[PDB]
Ligand binder design. Sequence first.
Ligand SMILES: CCCCCCCCCCCCCCCCCC(=O)OC[C@H](COP(=O)(O)OCCN)OC(=O)CCCCCCCCCCCCCCCCC
Ligand SMILES: Nc1ncnc2c1ncn2[C@@H]1O[C@H](COP(=O)(O)OP(=O)(O)O)[C@@H](O)[C@H]1O
Lengths: 39, 97, 120, 344, 459, 52, 319, 98, 47
Amino acid sequence: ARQWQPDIEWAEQFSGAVMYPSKETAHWKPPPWNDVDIL
Amino acid sequence: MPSTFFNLTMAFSLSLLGTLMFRSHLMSTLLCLEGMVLSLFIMTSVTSLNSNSMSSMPIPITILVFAACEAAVGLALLVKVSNTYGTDYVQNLNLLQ
Amino acid sequence: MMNGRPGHEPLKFLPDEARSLPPPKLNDPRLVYMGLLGYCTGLMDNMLRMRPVMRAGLHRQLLFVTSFVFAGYFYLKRQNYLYAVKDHDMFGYIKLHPEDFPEKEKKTYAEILEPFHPVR
Amino acid sequence: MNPITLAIIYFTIFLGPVITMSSTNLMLMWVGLEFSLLAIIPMLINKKNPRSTEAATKYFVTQATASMIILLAIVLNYKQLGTWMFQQQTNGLILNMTLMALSMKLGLAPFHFWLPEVTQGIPLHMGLILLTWQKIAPLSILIQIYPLLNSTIILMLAITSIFMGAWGGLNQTQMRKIMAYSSIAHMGWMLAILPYNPSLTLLNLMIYIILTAPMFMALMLNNSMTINSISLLWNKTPAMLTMISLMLLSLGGLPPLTGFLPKWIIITELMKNNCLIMATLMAMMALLNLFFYTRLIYSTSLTMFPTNNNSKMMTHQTKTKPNLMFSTLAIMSTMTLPLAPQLI
Amino acid sequence: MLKIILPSLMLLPLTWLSSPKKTWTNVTSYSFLISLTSLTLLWQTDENYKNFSNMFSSDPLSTPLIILTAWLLPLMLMASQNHLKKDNNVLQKLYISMLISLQILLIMTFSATELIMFYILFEATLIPTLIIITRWGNQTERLNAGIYFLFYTLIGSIPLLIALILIQNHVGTLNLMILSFTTHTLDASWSNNLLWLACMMAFLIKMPLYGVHLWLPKAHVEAPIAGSMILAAILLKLGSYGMIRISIILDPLTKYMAYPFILLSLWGMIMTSSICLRQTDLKSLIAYSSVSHMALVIASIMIQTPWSFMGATMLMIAHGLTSSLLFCLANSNYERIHSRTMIMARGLQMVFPLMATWWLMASLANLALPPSINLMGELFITMSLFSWSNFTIILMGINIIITGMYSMYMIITTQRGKLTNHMINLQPSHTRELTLMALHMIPLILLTTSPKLITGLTM
Amino acid sequence: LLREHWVHILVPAGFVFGCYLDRKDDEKLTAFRNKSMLFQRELRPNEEVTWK
Amino acid sequence: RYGLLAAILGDKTTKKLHEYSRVITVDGNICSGKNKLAKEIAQQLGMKHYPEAGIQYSSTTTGDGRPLDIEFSGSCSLEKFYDDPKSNDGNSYRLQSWLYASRLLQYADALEHLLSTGQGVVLERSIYSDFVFLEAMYNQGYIRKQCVDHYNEIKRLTLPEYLPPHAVIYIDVPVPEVQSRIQKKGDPHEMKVTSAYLQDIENAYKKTFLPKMSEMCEVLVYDSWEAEDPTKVVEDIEYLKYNKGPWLKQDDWTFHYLRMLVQDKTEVLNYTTIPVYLPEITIGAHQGSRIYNSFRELPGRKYAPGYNAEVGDKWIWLK
Amino acid sequence: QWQEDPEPEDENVYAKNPDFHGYDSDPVVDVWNMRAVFFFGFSIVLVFGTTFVAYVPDYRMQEWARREAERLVKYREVNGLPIMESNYFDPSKIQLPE
Amino acid sequence: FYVREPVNAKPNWLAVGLSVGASVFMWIYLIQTHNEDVLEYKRRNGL
Ligand SMILES: CCCCCCCCCCCCCCCCCC(=O)OC[C@H](COP(=O)(O)OCCN)OC(=O)CCCCCCCCCCCCCCCCC
Ligand SMILES: Nc1ncnc2c1ncn2[C@@H]1O[C@H](COP(=O)(O)OP(=O)(O)O)[C@@H](O)[C@H]1O
């Protein structure tokens, strides 16, 4: 038996700058891991 | 002062309405922010002066000394911003969304 | 609340008046709990730092079980006082303002007639 | 930082709240607030990343205007009573200003927008100070003036904060902002009981500090600002998975852990004072806070998220340890409940 | 009652300190004896109940349970030695400790004088249970099931917290002894009509009522066998124990504020019983059987007639033992079959002769065969319900016919018919599996000999 | 004999402690020792406690 | 430990630096003889010569130092890299990602030796010269585009913090040369390396790496002939002037923080484990948990250094 | 696809240890984990427990009440008093709202 | 043993003596406080 450990897809949702993505909110992208931006 | 302390107070509210509604340049806020400190300094000095409360005159100035540095910090942030974005415009400050 | 009380010690931990109260028995369940609370802190530390959980820092384990407990006796000693002040204060008022807290007579059930709702 | 500067700043960030608390002349309370504002801004931009300058410039403007409003209240009082300090007689509007202003510096309710954003752009460390050693100062000023403030407003800011904090948190996935949102919420409970029993505000704060300080030093042990990042905790450092689980459920009000006491006694005090309307709604959405806490629980502990091969490399190397404070503040926090009577 | 509790706590040190190979026997052997110390509480010999000390008490209603709570920890630890025997030696010692804390907490909750002590311990039991269900749950959906189990109980719980703090202010102490010997008569206002709902709703939720029972089917489905045993045998009955001790106050309102629930439960009893009739997952069917047979209980703790109450006390202890027995044997089929589907695995008696006898006795306990406490229980609730309104027999009469049908269908399509051609060959029965069962039924046979002990407070 | 039987003595010891703590509960709740109405009797000869 | 306390009281990298103290890397193709030049340059100025980063370089770095089992070291084979290019399991990308982590550890260990001892360090290939392998791999069917992005993201997140190589000694030997050089030391795997791939490595060296580091650091190139003559190359290094570059601003109070970073290996590679789930990199929870329970149970690893009795540690009851 | 383990089969513990009792894989632990479970389970809980529970005396007073009735019924009938008078709390004690 | 000699190879003997010695000062002050305390309590009140 393999109690189902979460796969990649279950993990994917928790990425993104907002859990429950809105209409325009989803357009956003996760913050840079280094806390420094490219602009 | 009965109505001379209402002009200064409304000056502070007109300066309040200013700092709270931004528009482009950040400097205009900071500058506005200072308009309040002047109004507070004037009102504190005015009442202290007509209450003959000399023990309190220290405050009118302590208010300015702390307000000046406060502004110093504010401007260094401003210079830091138009070094990172080439402008003081607030819209630029929208990365933390 | 209890601050502003007459005689309040402006920054003191436990005013000497608290001497009058009994000292907390060192084995008071609470102080013993603090002890266990402490031992666990110690054990937990060892764990988070990846050391043999129980067989390590046997000096630290002692510092912990003995720091927490030390703290307890002197804290409980106070919290005990605070509660004791509360009664001094509360009971006193009940008297100084007696009319407001009047003794009441409770009619023997014989007299009182609570209604009976039948279950049926 | 030239270690000298580090000292001057840190001293100010620490003299800042302490002057506020110790003094009675409100003016001296205002400059205590002013020094905290000046000291925190340098540390906030330590990385000097583009996000950081944004953080500080917001924090500063929000802090500065509130500071000016607090001063106006003191200036107005000076003319309604010669005293430099709020008294029974104080005009009601004078006090309400101080509530709004101080509720902006503390960031409660409809002024809760700056905190989540500054908590997002500052380091985890300076995040803690910005959340917990900067709330002590303003709260002190409020707790001192509690007898005089309005029960209605506080309650509205209290309830609003609870809701905003909860709702905001549900969507957030960045940890720094999840904590910012929690702080808004807990800050709400604290200000709810201020008019009735200030002494409980000081409990609902300490417990928040004894809960949040371990929680953040946990987030940074692995410096994870993402839940996905904290979820691989099981590989990076397995032991903290157990206590991270209890501390987060403790932050929410679940009964065996220490976190229930602040909510329980605040509810007991509000019902003693008859707010069984307000208290009920607060407790209910308080339950929303646990949902997002447990969703994190799921990712970090109850379920094991997939990790990266390069992680095996980080395991090899000895993990720099978590300070002792973590333990002493994790246990005193996760389980002191059996000792509640003496805490209150 | 600190021997039923302190020695229990010490189990935790033993699960941790003991050798990885010997951890299982030290824990199971010792809690069997922990149950033996629990039996001392049964020595009543007088009407006056036993107030051990200020915080800890045991009256006829709690005593029959404290013993069951202590009894199942041994069994739970024996039913989960298989799954959980594939773990890393520190996941086991966590599971064993989790099971240990449940009865420590549950023993105290059932043996608590202060109603809010009940609340704190009451809602704490969710922590150990949620970990058992979510951490070791086999299916992808346990994260979901855990959420359902935490929120339905939690949203009900905060209203009770407000209500109990409310009565403390109204009366001045939440001590069940005093609250009983003091005059707390609600006044049928609109507000009180809410208080009553606040106190009963949290208890009505974990005692699945027809309206809020979706949490229990989802929870037991993916929960490991030990969690499913705990939820059915002790966890759900926490709600019943609460309704018995809390309705001492709120005495006048339940006369007329109960109709809504009573009708919800009796119609619920029929529909929950019926959907058992066509449900493909065996663990699913036992769970709805549990909802229906618990819907009878909320309809006896609300009619409030002496017979109802002890009908309830009889059925709760009895159904607790029977349900576990059913959940335990369901697991034995699940581990060899590897699927929860009822249609697969047909004909087992042909290959597992005895487990089938245990299956038959468990089903006869499930339906009301007469020389069983299970029947005495239903016979009594049935009587009072009839007294409440003679028409009740119709609805409590469609349930009996349906209960017979699904109970035997579990035996007919799982333990009879032609053998499944060649599922993974089904290894013979372990002696642990069979004992875990024997340990459930031998007490069911012994209790049926002298029903007086589990009759409740009323009689 | 403490070699893996000091483990086996953990729980047995908990019982002892339990009973002790329990019998130190009676000692506390000993008002109305014999002052209850249904059970008030004159201490029979050579008995200083009706119930201990 | 090294911390502000130590730094406050002396312990300044400023007082421990000397002309011979620099970060010098020598980079070349798969076989540039850089191994030899390195040792010599090292012998010349006493520079601690760090060996090229390996799969088990981290294991040699940590604890016992005995080589770890492949699965414990991330299951990477350079050997399988070559015999099975564009593999279904992606051992080649996993090999490259582990290699970047290994040099990150090596570069950080090198910087720690440089700022503490004061001695310089020759590190052969570096994090700065790792991208050429990936560029060539993407130019070939070896790695797909996202795989490239994931490496670039890790590189952008971690490499900027560390100071640049002072100078970057370089060898060049045309692809024909290296292939031939391969034949001399025969190894079935190393042998089967498609030339075009070697073409892409050097190219990425010349086109992108060589100039890029030429501004920030002293790039001196040496044809093969200049090479094999460590004396001459060593001479030239001692000749170049260490002026241009970001190293100029490293005041003592700035070095302290850099030191405290390299002093903490768990941070050096903190961003190497970022939760970006590309399929090759993912451990997977069930496999990862097993590899962990097994790596953590190795003697001396089940507890922190100094506390595991298996290898003979003592005094644990008072530590 | 990510790296992860291939499904682990479940062993036929009955292939080795043909005397498997279901508790643990190695044989001696199994034997000593049933020799202590049947014993502490059945031999001294179902037996000693039922012995003690059977001998609890006059549980909840229902052995006392079948005699007290008998002497009350003996006393009430012989002295001519009603066997169960119809008011329990005497009417004289009650002070009905006048 | 260890390539990088564990920093914890041999105990920080200061950390023992301020950890052990500190705790023994705690007790001797704590136990002292109690008996001393009991006394004052006893005499402060009648006995
Ligand atoms: C009031 C009661 C509340 C509920 C009490 C029972 C639940 C306590 C809370 C549990 C919350 C976490 C649940 C999920 C945890 C998952 C942990 C896990 O997956 O295992 C890995 C973890 C770390 O492994 P590591 O210790 O590093 O391995 C050593 C190898 N030599 O392995 C470990 O962390 C091992 C150590 C864990 C800590 C010990 C926990 C023991 C159980 C605590 C019971 C406390 C009972 C209190 C009863 C109170 C009654 C009033
Ligand atoms: N980042 C990398 N990706 C793939 N292969 C690499 C990487 N770094 C080094 N290698 C391989 O390591 C092998 C040995 O390199 P090197 O030590 O220069 O050879 P030699 O020891 O013969 O001089 C080379 O064939 C090269 O392909």
